[PDB]
Structures are given as C-alpha cells and as structure tokens.
Amino acid sequence: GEAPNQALLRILKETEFKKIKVLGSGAFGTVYKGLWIPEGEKVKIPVAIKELSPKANKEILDEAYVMASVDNPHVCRLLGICLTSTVQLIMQLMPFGSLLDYVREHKDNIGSQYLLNWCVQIAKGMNYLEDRRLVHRDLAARNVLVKTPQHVKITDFGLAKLLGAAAAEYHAEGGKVPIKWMALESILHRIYTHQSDVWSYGVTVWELMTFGSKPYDGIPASEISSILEKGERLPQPPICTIDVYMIMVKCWMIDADSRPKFRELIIEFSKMARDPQRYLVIQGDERMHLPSPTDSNFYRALMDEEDMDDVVDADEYLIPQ
Ligand SMILES: COc1cc(N2CCC(N3CCN(C)CC3)CC2)ccc1Nc1ncc(Cl)c(Nc2ccccc2P(C)(C)=O)n1
After folding, report:
1. Phosphoserine-modified residues are where?
2. Labelling 101: which of 59, 118, 138, 291 has CA 20 to 30 A away?
3. DSSP letter at 211?
4. Would you state the CATH architecture of domain 97-278?
C-alpha cells in the first residue's frame, strides 16, 4: 500500500478501433462491442468499449486507474483509454457475456465440473485483488464475464477502492450499492473489507448453484438488513450437498473474521472440483457439454467481419506502445 504504482496508462486513438454493436446499456452507461486495429501491427483485437460531463470523466478515470493496476488471468484487462469528449474505457471482449446470463441460458447443459471450476477461478481473482489491497465492493454473477466456458474473469471496478497503507477498511459515504450482495456490516455501517467481499462471493456462488436465481426474490432491499439480522440466509440450492452449502453459510457469518479467506476458498473448491459429482447433484451430469469455438469462423459472426485471419485475443497482445 506504499509502493509506487508504475503501471502504464495507455492512450488509444479513436481512429484505430470501430464500434460494431451495443452489448448493453444501463446505470453503468453503454458498452459496445468493437474491433481494435493498432495501425502498423497486422492485428485485430476484439474489444469492449465503455462510456459513462465533468463528473462522468472523473469516475471513468478512477476505474481506469484501478483496471490499469491489475494483471491477473481471472481479472479483466484494461487495454487503454480513449480521450474523446467523454472518456472511453477499452477492455478485452469477453465473447460469452456475463456468467449470470450464461448459467441462465445454458442451465440444462451446465455440469458440476464447470460450476465448481468457476468458483475456483472467481476466488483466484478475488484473492489476487486482496493481494493488491483492492476491495471490489460489487462482486456478483453479473460482474463475472465469460471468455470461454472454462475461463471467467471479474469486471466492473466502478465501486472498487484501494485500501491505503495502514487502512484495514473502506468507509463509504452514501452511494447506491446492491443490498442483496452486501455483507451486513456494509449495510448497517457502510464498512467494506476483503471479508465483506467474501460475503458477496457466497451470494455469487449461490447465484451459480441456482443457475441464476435472484437472491431474496420478491423481497424489497428495504427488508434485507432486517432479515439477515434475525439470522435468516439464502436457502440451500437443490443441487448443493451440505458440503457446498456449508461453505456458503460460512461466507455469511456475522463475525467477518469467521468467514473464509479467498485463499481457503480456492483450496476447498479445487478439492471438490476433483470429485464434482460428490458435491453437486445434477441430473444428466455425465452427459453434458458446453461449446467454446475458438475457430476463426466464430469471430467472423461475432464481429460481423468477413476477414478475421489476423484476429488476436487481448490475452495474446502484450505489445506496448
Ligand atoms: C459478446 O460479448 C458480450 C455480449 C453480451 N450480451 C450478449 C449475451 C446476453 N444475452 C442475454 C440474453 N440473451 C438471451 C442471450 C445472451 C446479453 C448481453 C454481454 C457482454 C459481452 N462481453 C463483454 N466483454 C467485456 C466487457 Cl467490459 C463487457 N461489459 C458489459 C457489457 C454489457 C453489459 C454490461 C457490461 P459490464 C459487467 C457493466 O462491464 N462485456
């Protein structure tokens, strides 16, 4: 928390990438699917372009600072920023959307092996963020993106906060935060730690184990803190053995120091990933398959471009400016 942050902020020309379609709009702004072509390089990189006004440019550049400071296979990569009227965040395109939408659409072909492996990767990413003293404050299935069915990464650092040295927690001021993923101490006292991210990790796992069910469905956020304070929690999903449900309940304990560490969640879920049918009970588990075409034909349909001979995923484009 005291070392100098010598990350490179890369400025990209607007001319060298093309918007193609709207992937989504909302409170976060708008996200476009696009192709980035660094002139000189015989390369086409599939990218996602996020736009959020003086107040907007500050918040965008705060997220850019955070994303430019992380480099992990299970955290999403910031490729650079573009200095238009409103600043654009250029990020790596995750061609399969959010893990929440993925498990909802493919609920009938998702096996226990995939579910448990996603839990490992998400915990690997969150453990890396803890190593960097970064509290995400918005971990949820909607903020886990699918590069391939076997590879997911964490996104949306709009609420992320770097804990300065000798600061063990972040105290927020007001703001709109998703109540149903927040730890109780965050709801009541606006205190955020890496252990409050663990609470959100448990809700995220619950989202996956229910194939994308909404937590506390049909209950107003007004009543969430009242529910948890009385000792009520999310129910045991049908496919979950007590082994898996016990891990979720440990993430939702009142004492934040009694919750597991992301380190330990990696170990536990990786152990279960070696005998998946012993911990998740899914009918037809042995006959499930999820397609991940890395063919050059796959990108021609995704990017709506006939020629994709030079397509390079952002994870293979490491060439500096
Ligand atoms: C193909 O690429 C995508 C498509 C969708 N679509 C397609 C599926 C989905 N639908 C749903 C229902 N349908 C029936 C069937 C599948 C709808 C969304 C969504 C996301 C990405 N990738 C992507 N990479 C990087 C970013 Cl950085 C990003 N960011 C992003 C994109 C869109 C929304 C939110 C974000 P966030 C969390 C705030 O970054 N998004």
Report:
1. 292, 296
2. 59
3. T
4. Orthogonal Bundle (1.10)
